[PDB]
Structure 1
Amino acid sequence: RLELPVIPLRNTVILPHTTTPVDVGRAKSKRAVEEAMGADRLIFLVAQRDPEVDDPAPDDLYTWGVQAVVKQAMRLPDGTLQVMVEARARAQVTDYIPGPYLRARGEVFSEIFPIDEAVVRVLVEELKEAFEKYVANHKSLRLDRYQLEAVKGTSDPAMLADTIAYHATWTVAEKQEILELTDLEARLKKVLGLLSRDLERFELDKRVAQRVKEQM
């Protein structure tokens, strides 16, 4: 039944439905590497909680995290692992089994389906323009721009919200909220809010920076 472990994150934020390399740089987490391949090559990543400690304890960890798949494994003799992943869906844990290693008994997945995408079509472009005009105008975030020809034709809120969260950067608390927010509509809402805040934040900086220009 696809049993999963409880592997937390250290300093990196991993978004669901997004290909991102995973760095396992913990020496004491190597014991989870061999059992990750022993669970039908399924690895479960827990988002970065309260500052990371090297004490393995179920009470110090949480049941909310992202699920990752293993394609290939390439190793170095330095205690750090590079694995490329492609998240399928968020997986929750109901009953935690102490280890070591900490084993988790999975349950039915929290999946969603698109119904009546007519409103979703307008929401997609409304959310798109907010950061499309931001990155074009504001450049301190330094995100890529030559993927518009391929992302415009895709209509999938679950993937696109996590992709936009992966691209832009903001508070890690709401980042990991998006990682483990059941309400995908709330993910889109907060993403749109943050884009609007960043837009007005850059306009304030430009006018106040240009205000200082006029002052000098």
Structure 2
Amino acid sequence: RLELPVIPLRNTVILPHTTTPVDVGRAKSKRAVEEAMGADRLIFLVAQRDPEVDDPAPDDLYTWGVQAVVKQAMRLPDGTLQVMVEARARAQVTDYIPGPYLRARGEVFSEIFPIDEAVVRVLVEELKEAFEKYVANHKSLRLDRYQLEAVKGTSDPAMLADTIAYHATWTVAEKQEILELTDLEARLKKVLGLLSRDLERFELDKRVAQRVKEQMDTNQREYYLREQMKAIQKELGGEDGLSDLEA
């Protein structure tokens, strides 16, 4: 099972099977990377406690996590040790001997396996059209637009969910409740629901943008018309709001 150092985090939750740069900018934590190389080059990424602290502590983790492993041996000469990772699968803690330096006594990976696969086929093509139009809509993402055109053809709903739900922002507790179950196709449904709420808030933004614009044009029109009235009083002039005052 091989006890591994739980190397601490700032805010980043990792899903399995994804090449990711982790930037270990903490001198309490780069020595945990030295202990990681002293632990078969292995990592066990557990989520940093929310709203952030700066201390590896037993009161600064969670109740799940995944294992990772070094890909580049990159030193930054500023107090940061950039490690490239790729997360393995989900496990937990037997004995978190605390720290500096924190470990967990490692598990074996939690191994859930797909049954009911044509519903997975319907939900993968729903995922596909969903993420498709998600990329098309949310241009605040500025996303790479040459990739799902290449990786559409596969059927690995684990890895599909990994790379598809990977690139896009939604908050930390949602990353948790994906990370924190052995239930597989319900979390695929959870990802699809996230995509649905994205499209929902998108369209509600659109709607109130249009209500803004029509109130703007309405106020401008009403100003122009009240000036038409003023100048008509001027070029009638016999109807001056004034000869009554001289009278």
TM-score between the two structures when normalised by the length of structure 2: 0.78
Name the SS of the counterpart of 2:43 in structure 1.
strand
Change (3 A) 1:77 1:55: same
- C-alpha deviation, 1:53, in angstroms: 2.6
Distance 2:200 2:61 in 1: 37
Change (3 A) 1:7 1:69: same
- C-alpha deviation, 1:21, in angstroms: 0.6
Q: Which consecutive aligned stretches of 4+ in structure 1 deviate over 3 angstroms post-superposition? A: none
- Are the equivalent residues in 1 in contact too, given 2:41–2:70 (CA < 8 A)? yes
Distance 1:193 1:47 in 2: 23
Q: After superposition, what is the alpha-carbon deviation per residue over 1:12-69, rounded to whole angstroms, capped at 9, x for unaligned?
A: 3322221111111112112211110011111112223223333443243334222111
Structure with the bigger percentage of strand: 1
**Farther-moved stretch of structure 1 (46-55 vs 22-31):** 46-55
- Are the equivalent residues in 1 in contact too, given 2:4–2:42 (CA < 8 A)? yes
Matched, 1:193 2:193: yes
- Are the equivalent residues in 1 in contact too, given 2:48–2:61 (CA < 8 A)? no
Q: Which has the higher contact order (CA 8 A, sep 6+)?
A: 1
Name the SS of the counterpart of 2:92 in structure 1.
strand
**Farther-moved stretch of structure 1 (65-74 vs 9-18):** 9-18
Q: After superposition, what is the alpha-carbon deviation per residue over 1:118-140, rounded to whole angstroms, capped at 9, x for unaligned?
A: 22111101122122112213312
- Are the equivalent residues in 1 in contact too, given 2:73–2:83 (CA < 8 A)? yes
5+ residue gaps, structure 2, are 214-226, 230-247
- Are the equivalent residues in 2 in contact too, given 1:10–1:52 (CA < 8 A)? yes
Change (3 A) 1:183 1:51: same
Matched, 1:215 2:228: yes
Q: CA RMSD in A?
A: 3.1
Alignment length (residue pairs): 216
- C-alpha deviation, 1:81, in angstroms: 1.4
5+ residue gaps, structure 1, are none
- Are the equivalent residues in 2 in contact too, given 1:66–1:180 (CA < 8 A)? no
Q: After superposition, what is the alpha-carbon deviation per residue over 1:78-122, rounded to whole angstroms, capped at 9, x for unaligned?
A: 121111112121221122223442232122320122234222111
**Farther-moved stretch of structure 1 (57-66 vs 27-36):** 57-66
